[PDB]
Amino acid sequence: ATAAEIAALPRQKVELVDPPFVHAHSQVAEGGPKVVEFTMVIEEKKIVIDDAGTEVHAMAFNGTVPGPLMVVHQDDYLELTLINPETNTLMHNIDFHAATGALGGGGLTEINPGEKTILRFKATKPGVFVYHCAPPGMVPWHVVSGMNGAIMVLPREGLHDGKGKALTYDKIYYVGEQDFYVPRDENGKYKKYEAPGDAYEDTVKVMRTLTPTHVVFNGAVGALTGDKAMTAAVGEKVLIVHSQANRDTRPHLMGGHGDYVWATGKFNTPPDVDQETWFIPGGAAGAAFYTFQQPGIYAYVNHNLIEAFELGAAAHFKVTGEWNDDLMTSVLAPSG
Amino acid sequence: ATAAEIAALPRQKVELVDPPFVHAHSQVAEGGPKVVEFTMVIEEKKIVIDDAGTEVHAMAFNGTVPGPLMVVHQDDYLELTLINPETNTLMHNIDFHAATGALGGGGLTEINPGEKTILRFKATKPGVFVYHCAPPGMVPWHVVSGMNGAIMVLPREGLHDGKGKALTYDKIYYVGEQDFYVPRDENGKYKKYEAPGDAYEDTVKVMRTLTPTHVVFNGAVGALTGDKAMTAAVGEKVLIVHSQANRDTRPHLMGGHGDYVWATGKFNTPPDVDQETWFIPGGAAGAAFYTFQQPGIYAYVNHNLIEAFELGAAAHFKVTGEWNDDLMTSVLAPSG
Amino acid sequence: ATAAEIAALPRQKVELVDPPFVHAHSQVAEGGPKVVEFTMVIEEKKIVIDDAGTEVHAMAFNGTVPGPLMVVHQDDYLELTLINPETNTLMHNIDFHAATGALGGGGLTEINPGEKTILRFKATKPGVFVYHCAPPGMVPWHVVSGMNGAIMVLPREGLHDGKGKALTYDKIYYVGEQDFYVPRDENGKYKKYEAPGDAYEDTVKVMRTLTPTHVVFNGAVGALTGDKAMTAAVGEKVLIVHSQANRDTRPHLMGGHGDYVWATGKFNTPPDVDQETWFIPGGAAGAAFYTFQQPGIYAYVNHNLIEAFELGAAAHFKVTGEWNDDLMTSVLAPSG
């Protein structure tokens, strides 16, 4: 398309919502290609990640960890206005794995505190993709400080299974998984700092052990449980987008399955089916489609169970509806 | 199916056998859906996992690590009588990744020492699946103490490749891989404990390093070698089911390949072919089909060679038959 | 086929070239099956792997880490003359994952210093495959000392996509990734040793932590960056073969994608498409095909960003050509 042709395309301003919820959108494209506009303000802020009051100096796109899910359709253009407030202390940028050129846009979006930039790229490939900050020389530090999220580029005709039958979800949730490397003092106690820069040296030493101190969903232990549990009802079709910008993960819905799973996160690659536990490599996003069949509480976890239950990578789904005794039944309840 | 219809189905009691062997079964289902009955007693027992005499307080389904492979066909019902003897000290349960609802059955099978329970579920999806204990709040500890195994839900018409051609194995083995985290003393020597509870705190500390001290097949270093090496013959078709309930693995048959590999372990997902090394994420089971073409010894290993040869993840196959010089030949034996 | 037939096949000697480059070959086979002859001399030598003068006693096939890529076509025979000079101190051999029998040829090629051997095997399966030294009892030590490479067995009719359309590359690169485990003294300084054997004990201790001190491409930090960046032009089709003989990796082309990726490395397994980050398990090779669309510098990395930017797994591609503003454009450059 020419610059003129692009300039004539309809524009649509999208309002982002905080994970795990996703902004309003239509699975099947409404009309031809458009320039979908988004704006995100970068916020360097302290976040508490566990019940011991452990702090991380988060570098959050739109104020959240992970950054919000942006949804467009194949061949639409995504135009992001990215803002770095003067209240911040570091330079930041953004690299869209969904984009083509200049390090995913990282090379064209380096903004110091007080600056903003506007990047536009054509979403030529359908699927879920990670996006993350990548400042030359300080790439992993920003990413493991929570500066990453994902976007979903839906096929214009919506989702389909391997044989072309449409797959239409009732609900969609975005789970961003984050590995954190929090420094500890001589007494095994997590350290606190009053400036992001202050923790850099100590954090790099922990990062080099390749052993995170915490692995969490939506920025903190228990973030997606209890009251923030995701919800659904028997019969509902749910798409769960999951990303990990720096380290491998292996999602599993305890009590359910991934009926269709685009493990590589790319829609032109046929989905795997009937999955118990799928795999998403560090630096990628994946997506699982499941139709709930039983009511109750489900644990959605990274299935290295130490990472899920000792380090924090566990979320819950609360499902309403009628119990199905054909699928499962307690013939004899626990007894002497 | 209604309660009445399920009650009318035929029932077959199966006698389990210890890994790596698999109880008798038919690849192609004989007759219509059945309620297949299994019984397993849980044994908390001390086991030795290496030649030095290192001990682990195992939590073992049917007394073995891994628990035995249960085999059924799609749409059969699996009815498990699970017994927790009064001689044990902890509450246990079971989560079948093959099942739908109540955390894989975990929420309906919590039994204290002195109790039993009977759970029935419909095996609606074909493939190999992990099953493991999962007591709320103590999940990884039970699993990495060896309380896990797998089941195989065969398609009613047996296995087929991705294009529909039947794949019939001559024999099958089940290799359960287990990551152990054994505490060490100040001399770097593994510690022993009177009771399993005494080891909890020290073990959790090791677990948090995400670095196992041992990674073994069938419960111990070298368990599948020597007189217990697996066997085959040139021309023989072997299915190798492999599971890891907590940590990733990358099986490799040194000197051979994975002709057909359902790396995700799900039979409705076409198998990869001509594999050198496949990948099974923690929390899943996979299966590889191979027709041996050369006689001799083969090493079957987790291909992180440090894990295979330093930590214990290596098994052997002894293969009988005639050498094929077309496939391979020593043109010049080692010489000056 | 018949004994006479194999004897009558043409023999062709090929001259190897050092990675990341690849010796001359044709994508579509030229003529019928041939016995392709290669010769490699093993070199035990000290190499420097980082900017701090860190040393490793490398065990290098053909004097390079990784060993060179050998290219043949399906059903050709690969006949390797492997030489171990009297100047070396250890016994070595070679295991081709592409081969069938005798531990990939390892059982037939054990050569002490001062000896040579000639192995021939039929390349019956198409794909890229790892080859590595594997002396019984010291397999990981040789492999993590850099004694590994890969071969590519192209289909006789060249590469094709999942729909049968031909995929012809303009150039090919071979990126071998190596995890090193270098001992450090109590001050944190990397240790140096007089002979390879002297470092054995200290090295195995580091290996058991499953945490490499360095993860590099082409044998050293920055080996494929700056003046040694790989190159391409907009519109050019490039195949990137990647291997890791001992540990998992997750390649990503920053600013690009893997248009077609044989993640398992086997050509009879349809390639995944539009990949952002792919996954190659330890003990395997994979291949990605990409058509460059934008000029500039690209970072090709292992996407656990700590491994890429702190440990060394980052390479660069320098691409020439015209910028495509349709694909990506800076609507507003960084500004207050």
Ligand SMILES: O=N[O-]
């Ligand atoms: O799904 N937790 O084992």
Ligand SMILES: O=N[O-]
């Ligand atoms: O390639 N090691 O079994």
Ligand SMILES: O=N[O-]
């Ligand atoms: O290519 N690093 O995001």
Ligand SMILES: [Cu+2]
């Ligand atoms: Cu940043």
Ligand SMILES: [Cu+2]
């Ligand atoms: Cu990236």
Ligand SMILES: [Cu+2]
């Ligand atoms: Cu238990």
Ligand SMILES: [Cu+2]
């Ligand atoms: Cu589980």
Ligand SMILES: [Cu+2]
């Ligand atoms: Cu060697």
Ligand SMILES: [Cu+2]
């Ligand atoms: Cu190998």
